Amino acid sequence: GSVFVKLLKASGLTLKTGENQNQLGVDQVIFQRKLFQALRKHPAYPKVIEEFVNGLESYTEDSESLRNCLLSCERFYSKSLIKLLLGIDILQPAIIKMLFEKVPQFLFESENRDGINMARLIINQLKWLDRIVDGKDLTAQMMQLISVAPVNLQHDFITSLPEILGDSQHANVGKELGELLVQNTSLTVPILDVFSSLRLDPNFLSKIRQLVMGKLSSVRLEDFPVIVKFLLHSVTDTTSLEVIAELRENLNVQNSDKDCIVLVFDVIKSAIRYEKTISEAWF
Amino acid sequence: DLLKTSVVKSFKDLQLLQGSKFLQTLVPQRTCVSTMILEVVRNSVHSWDHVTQGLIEFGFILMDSYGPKKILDGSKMTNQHACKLGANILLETFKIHEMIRQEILEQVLNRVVTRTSSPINHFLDLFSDIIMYAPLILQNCSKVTETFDYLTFLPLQTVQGLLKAVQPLLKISMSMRDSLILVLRKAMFASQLDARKSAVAGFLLLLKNFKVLGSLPSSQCTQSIGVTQVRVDVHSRYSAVANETFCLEIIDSLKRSLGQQADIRLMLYDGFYDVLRRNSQLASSIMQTLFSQLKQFYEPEPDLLPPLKLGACVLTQGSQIFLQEPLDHLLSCIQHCLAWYKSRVVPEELYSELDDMLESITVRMIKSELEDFELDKSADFSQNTNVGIKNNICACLIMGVCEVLMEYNFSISNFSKSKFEEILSLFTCYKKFSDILSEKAGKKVSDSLLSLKFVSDLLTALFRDSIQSHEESLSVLRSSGEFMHYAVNVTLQKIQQLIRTGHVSGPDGQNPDKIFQNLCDITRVLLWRYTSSISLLCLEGLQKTFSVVLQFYQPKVQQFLQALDVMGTEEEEAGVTVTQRASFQIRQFQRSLLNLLSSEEDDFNSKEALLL
């Protein structure tokens, strides 16, 4: 029983081997007070935070022991041991660092017998955290992970950004994702998805609409309906007459034939049908 | 114009016939334009293209013009009959001609999203009927899926209707379910209030029935644990975890709106209960979120006189003062959830503390008077001043909190002569501020935070008689007489608010069965006390109830007049009519009027005789 093992079972959480689930003796919150209290009362507080993380990381070096910490505990369900620890503030920044440390190993790994993809389950822990202690760093890690991620995985990682990152960091993302869009026409779909749900500058958005409509030639025909939808839903305030005029010139001067022109006009018809802000701006 | 007008005069006529026996003797029943047009729809199957073109148009025309108008903002029969016919034409023509199906549906939906000023409720019915007919046809419709995109700009009322009616389609298409969840999710991040207020409504309706709706996993549900490709296969350890950890994600997501506008917070306090009573493994996470929310507004220091921090519920930005958080609704939610927790859930230190807080909040709320709130002669509540409006809100939270603890302490102990005096003292504080607000003029109607269930139980316990020697503690409430017609006046408000809208304030607020049940318990209690001022109030409530049950619960009129009676076994169901039941109730009221008139009392009560 290491510092990590013993202090967990003291706080109510008993580690279980195999594919069973780690067992929580008290309420998932009551365990969170206990594990904080244990770490503050230890003879060396400052250094023990590193000691607890280390035991966590080495116990985690087992692929099966890892997927137990990423999955729900046992008492009426609580969350994963790692999510529980992610909650504790003093413990959070050091543990977030660890999670991204173990991610690369599973990045290019396929899904196993169970169908559980370790790479996606690790990041899933960051979803909807109460508060992010070190914010600026969580973003940089995420971004650098999105940069190197496989093209199948990286589409789900960008889409989760709003869920993973707090409200404070939406600015950093803009300048980042933006640059990713010029280097990739393949990221257009997921990027526009995120750009809708973040907090952004009107001036910044306008810079997006341009870079999207100019490279619109190298977009797949499947993504025309999905991409035009972002363009017409950013029209709510009045940029409307301006956006439409630009959208028109790019549709004008620049199975496959049918389903494209059909599904693109289904988005453009319902657009002017429902929202007058559009129809009048096209008129 | 000719057809339309003929429909109205056709109803007006067959209405006049039922108006008098004089006309029924002279005129043999007449075939009405209604059943004629509905035959034209039936004879259309023969491939009349020219007729259906005008039918759908006439269908909507009736629904457009004769549909509800004044109902939203404050001979309606011939309106109803026209609109019913209007929706029948469209519904009936839809079941017949295949290739105009999507055509009708495009037009029904189009009114749903685009109107937003005028009540759309009657079109949502047609829509809900169109789906209830053959859902497999509409399962794939992109016109139904597109709507989810404008679901953010739609008023919260239409979103609800849209989500209710669309559920039969959520039990087939996974893609539609995921396509809904994705849309709801990005609404959580929308700037506009009404989008986030919709997103909460969707996720609260999602969690409500997961055990039912989400039995089959969606792509968002499976993915919470990290499985993208799982289909048709269930090995439950990772299926049951994929379900639970996904729900948790939803709860963690809802939680952060508790930091948002007061309007959304309240919308959340109402939902968290119905989610607790259906999906029961979410109990500890719900209780958690509420206990973390209360811990912000609760002062732990014993003998710190305002046990809840009231000034914290008010935000100040730029000479505008809004209430943020309903600390009184926070309590109400905790009060009911705690009640379910203790009564149910026995197949640990969490719900134990919440109970201790509530009592601490009870005791300190009771013994803190007006200097700790800093009010009355000191703070004058003037609504033109920042100082006055911030005070008004406090006087209101104080009244709501008192109502909740009053309702909570009743559930704690029925038999303790001690805690009834706390209930009284909690009332005395409430009426302290209810007096202060009316003396000040002001601009109290639906304010009551008491659940209908309690008002029923409270009333039944006050008028009950049959009081056994251990139950004498009730005499603490019974002999007050102001708390006596406070209790009655609440029921009288709820029954009255039951006519205005179709809802009630507290838990099980809108539940056509649960409302109906309390109406029964509240009526048979008022009916006894009237036949034993209060008597007049009991009659006023008695009357308001009857007229409600008739114009809302009408199909249940039978079981309702049963609930007021005693038992009656089996072979009697074959022997007891609605005319049997009705007359028997009439004989009792016509008796007490007869006795009202026959008596020689110098003054005969006009108010009583009128509503009698």
Side-chain angles (χ1 to χ4, degrees), chain B residues 268-269 272-273 290 329-338:
Chain B
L268 197 30
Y269 293 157
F272 273 154
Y273 188 55
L290 295 174
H329 283 75
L330 218 189
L331 282 197
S332 176
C333 188
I334 300 184
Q335 192 275 324
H336 292 75
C337 295
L338 245 187

Side-chain angles (χ1 to χ4, degrees), chain B residues 52-291:
Chain B
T52 57
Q53 192 263 10
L55 268 174
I56 60 97
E57 190 61 71
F58 184 74
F60 283 115
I61 282 179
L62 286 184
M63 295 199 72
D64 291 328
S65 308
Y66 300 97
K69 35 205 58 187
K70 52 209 171 184
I71 301 187
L72 197 122
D73 289 279
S75 84
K76 301 174 189 173
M77 293 301 100
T78 56
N79 283 17
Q80 272 187 356
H81 295 338
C83 181
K84 175 123 67 176
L85 205 163
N88 284 346
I89 298 175
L90 289 167
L91 205 193
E92 211 64 18
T93 296
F94 179 96
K95 298 143 61 75
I96 302 306
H97 305 64
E98 277 191 331
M99 206 140 187
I100 54 88
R101 288 187 210 257
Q102 219 272 144
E103 171 66 10
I104 290 182
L105 194 111
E106 277 193 37
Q107 223 160 322
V108 170
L109 283 177
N110 248 65
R111 297 174 204 285
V112 174
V113 242
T114 204
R115 212 83 88 191
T116 281
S117 191
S118 321
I120 296 155
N121 286 326
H122 57 303
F123 287 115
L124 277 159
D125 290 306
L126 212 184
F127 185 59
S128 187
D129 286 341
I130 297 182
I131 299 183
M132 273 303 185
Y133 174 65
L136 299 178
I137 314 183
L138 312 172
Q139 68 159 0
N140 67 339
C141 273
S142 295
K143 196 74 268 179
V144 187
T145 304
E146 269 190 328
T147 322
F148 298 156
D149 301 19
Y150 305 108
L151 199 134
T152 61
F153 306 118
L154 288 178
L156 177 56
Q157 292 189 349
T158 297
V159 175
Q160 238 111 36
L162 202 69
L163 281 180
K164 300 289 183 181
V166 116
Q167 276 170 301
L169 286 179
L170 290 167
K171 279 224 147 187
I172 311 172
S173 183
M174 236 182 57
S175 39
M176 174 168 297
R177 202 174 307 103
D178 287 323
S179 208
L180 174 63
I181 295 177
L182 269 156
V183 168
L184 281 167
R185 181 179 287 124
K186 53 194 294 176
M188 308 269 302
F189 307 88
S191 60
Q192 173 70 255
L193 202 197
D194 274 314
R196 286 178 286 118
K197 188 178 297 180
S198 300
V200 174
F203 281 119
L204 271 179
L205 181 147
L206 213 182
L207 293 168
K208 249 200 242 174
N209 42 281
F210 220 101
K211 297 181 185 173
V212 185
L213 178 145
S215 51
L216 266 175
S218 48
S219 291
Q220 246 58 222
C221 184
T222 51
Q223 282 181 21
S224 101
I225 62 174
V227 302
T228 328
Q229 280 176 354
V230 171
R231 253 183 171 182
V232 184
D233 292 334
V234 167
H235 264 333
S236 39
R237 177 162 262 84
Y238 306 90
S239 267
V241 166
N243 264 258
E244 86 190 355
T245 54
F246 172 55
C247 282
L248 291 167
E249 285 193 349
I250 307 169
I251 245 79
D252 286 39
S253 210
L254 286 168
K255 175 167 185 171
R256 91 157 192 282
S257 85
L258 285 206
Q260 293 169 354
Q261 357 256 136
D263 248 337
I264 296 184
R265 275 149 155 172
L266 189 153
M267 181 174 55
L268 197 30
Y269 293 157
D270 284 76
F272 273 154
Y273 188 55
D274 281 86
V275 157
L276 217 198
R277 281 157 52 229
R278 202 172 302 232
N279 218 340
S280 298
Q281 286 124 329
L282 300 181
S284 49
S285 243
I286 296 177
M287 216 54 49
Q288 223 83 244
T289 295
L290 295 174
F291 166 80

Side-chain angles (χ1 to χ4, degrees), chain A residues 70-81:
Chain A
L70 301 169
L71 291 170
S72 135
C73 296
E74 192 177 6
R75 281 306 295 260
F76 228 93
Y77 32 78
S78 39
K79 44 206 74 174
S80 87
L81 154 60

